[PDB]
């Protein structure tokens, strides 16, 4: 009662991972992302795969 | 009076009216950011007491357009996305706008 | 002697495949193999120029969260597929437009893109989408730009007509870098070494050219140290 018109708008937002987000496995091991490290700074094996 | 959905928004330029259509509703697929106007709405307002040092300013520069107040739907701050769907519901007996 | 070193030279390129190669540097002194290998790996993995898809325009499409009749993949999926396009653009051009028109049932692949002779597709077999009806048709206009690093669509500086869809761009052509330091048989000395760099890329950048660009970057950055003064 009293309402003449309604307009509804749906907004789609892409959210990328960033520090502060919460990540977890299936064994109760939860955590918060602290840094997004560059690829050249992360540990790598003998085949060069980081 | 009756609040109207329209594209005639006082104190807002054509920069913020790019994404709305004739009826005052954003287009489908419009990439919007925080503060952007989605649907334009104007509400009738009553008489407002103007302070004397604003009556003077009205006297100097004669612009005065305060018949209606801008109460429009705006994107929340720190929210950026694409308009993917718009639905309009109209009461039985109210004129259907173009959109 | 002691004060003078032996400068390494490029001795071999071995092309295992279009996207895999090995580059051999010889000869190297003691310890210099690891130093050069690590420096080259860090430069190659971070600061390597390339070309990437940045904007797409598909007829009849307003936004990415939509569907087109006769196409089994959503526009999001099509853009994600286009992100894996390997394009080499002739020097002097930092911008190019290509077109993709296809009708009829079948997998729409990268070999169906019409280029202007200055653009080479490195993976024609890369599947872009699928047309599931004989009456289905697809018509896209793709923008390819030269750049460096990872430039997300949100980070691009801000008119844009509705229908132009931005694509996140990963310009770096280098995917994986490994390096091994082995013994070198040079003349009579046994202290010399050999560096083998295994590079897995998207095929757009030649191995030798990549090595010389990395060396140029390293030399330019060292130029500041060679002339140490208060600035």
Swiss-Prot record, chain A:
- Top-level lineage group: Bacteria
**Role summary:** DNA-dependent RNA polymerase catalyzes the transcription of DNA into RNA using the four ribonucleoside triphosphates as substrates.
Its family remark reads: Belongs to the RNA polymerase beta chain family.
Can you state the subunit structure given in the record?
A: The RNAP catalytic core consists of 2 alpha, 1 beta, 1 beta' and 1 omega subunit. When a sigma factor is associated with the core the holoenzyme is formed, which can initiate transcription.
Name of the protein in its database record? DNA-directed RNA polymerase subunit beta
Q: What's the source species for this entry? A: Vibrio cholerae serotype O1 (strain ATCC 39541 / Classical Ogawa 395 / O395)
Traced from the root, the source organism's taxonomic lineage reads: Bacteria, Pseudomonadati, Pseudomonadota, Gammaproteobacteria, Vibrionales
Q: Which gene encodes it?
A: rpoB
From Swiss-Prot, chain C:
Q: Where is this region: Alpha N-terminal domain (alpha-NTD)?
A: 1-229
A GO term from the CC aspect: DNA-directed RNA polymerase complex
User: If you read the UniProt record, what top EC class would you report for this enzyme, in one word?
Assistant: transferase
Tell me the domain of life.
Answer: Bacteria
GO term, biological process aspect, one: DNA-templated transcription
- Molecular functions per Gene Ontology: DNA binding; DNA-directed RNA polymerase activity; protein dimerization activity
What keywords sit in the KW lines? DNA-directed RNA polymerase, Nucleotidyltransferase, Transcription, Transferase
Report the catalytic activity: RNA(n) + a ribonucleoside 5'-triphosphate = RNA(n+1) + diphosphate
Q: What is its EC number?
A: 2.7.7.6
Read off the domain note. Answer: The N-terminal domain is essential for RNAP assembly and basal transcription, whereas the C-terminal domain is involved in interaction with transcriptional regulators and with upstream promoter elements.
Q: What does this protein do?
A: DNA-dependent RNA polymerase catalyzes the transcription of DNA into RNA using the four ribonucleoside triphosphates as substrates.
Kindly state the subunit structure of this protein. Homodimer. The RNAP catalytic core consists of 2 alpha, 1 beta, 1 beta' and 1 omega subunit. When a sigma factor is associated with the core the holoenzyme is formed, which can initiate transcription.
Q: Which family does it belong to?
A: Belongs to the RNA polymerase alpha chain family.
Protein name as catalogued: DNA-directed RNA polymerase subunit alpha
- Organism of origin: Vibrio cholerae serotype O1 (strain ATCC 39541 / Classical Ogawa 395 / O395)
State the taxonomy lineage: Bacteria, Pseudomonadati, Pseudomonadota, Gammaproteobacteria, Vibrionales
Q: Per UniProt, what is the name of the gene that codes for the protein in this document?
A: rpoA
């Amino acid at each position: 009662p009293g309402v003449l018109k309604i307009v509804k708008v749906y907004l789609a937002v892409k959210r990328r991972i960033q520090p502060g987000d919460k990540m977890a496995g299936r064994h109760g091991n939860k955590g918060v992302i602290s840094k997004i490290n560059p690829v050249e700074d992360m540990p790598y094996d003998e085949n060069g795969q980081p | 009076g009756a609040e109207e959905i329209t594209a005639d928004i006082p104190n807002v330029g054509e920069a913020a009216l790019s994404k709305l259509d004739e009826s005052g509703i954003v287009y489908i697929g419009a990439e919007v950011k925080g503060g952007d106007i989605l649907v334009g709405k104007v509400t009738p307002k009553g008489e407002t007491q103007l302070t004397p040092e604003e009556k003077l300013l009205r006297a100097i520069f004669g612009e005065k357009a305060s018949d209606v107040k801008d109460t429009s739907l705006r994107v929340p701050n720190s929210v950026a996305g694409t308009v993917i769907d718009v639905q309009v519901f109209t009461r039985d007996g109210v004129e259907k706008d173009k959109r | 002697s002691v004060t003078e070193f032996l400068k390494p030279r490029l001795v071999d390129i071995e092309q295992i495949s279009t996207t895999h190669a090995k580059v051999t540097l010889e000869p190297l002194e003691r310890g210099f193999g690891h130093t050069l290998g690590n420096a080259l790996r860090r430069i190659l993995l971070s600061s390597m120029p390339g070309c990437a898809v940045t904007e797409v325009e598909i007829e009849g499409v307003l936004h990415e969260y939509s569907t087109k009749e006769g196409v089994q993949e959503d526009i999001l999926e099509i853009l994600l597929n286009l992100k894996g396009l390997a394009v080499r653009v002739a020097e002097g051009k930092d911008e190019v437009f290509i077109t993709l028109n296809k009708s009829g049932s079948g997998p729409v692949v990268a070999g169906d893109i019409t280029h202007d002779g200055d653009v080479e597709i490195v993976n024609p077999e890369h599947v872009i989408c699928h047309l599931t009806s004989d009456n289905a048709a697809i018509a896209m206009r793709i923008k390819v730009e030269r750049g460096r690093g990872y430039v997300p669509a949100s980070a691009r500086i801000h008119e844009r007509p509705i229908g132009r869809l931005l694509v996140d761009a990963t310009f770096s052509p280098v995917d994986k870098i490994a390096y091994s330091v082995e013994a070198a048989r040079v003349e009579q000395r046994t202290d010399l070494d050999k560096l083998v760099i295994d590079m897995e890329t998207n095929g757009t950048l030649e191995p030798e050219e990549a090595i010389r660009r990395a060396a140029t970057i390293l030399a330019e950055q060292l130029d500041a140290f060679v002339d140490l003064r208060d600035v």
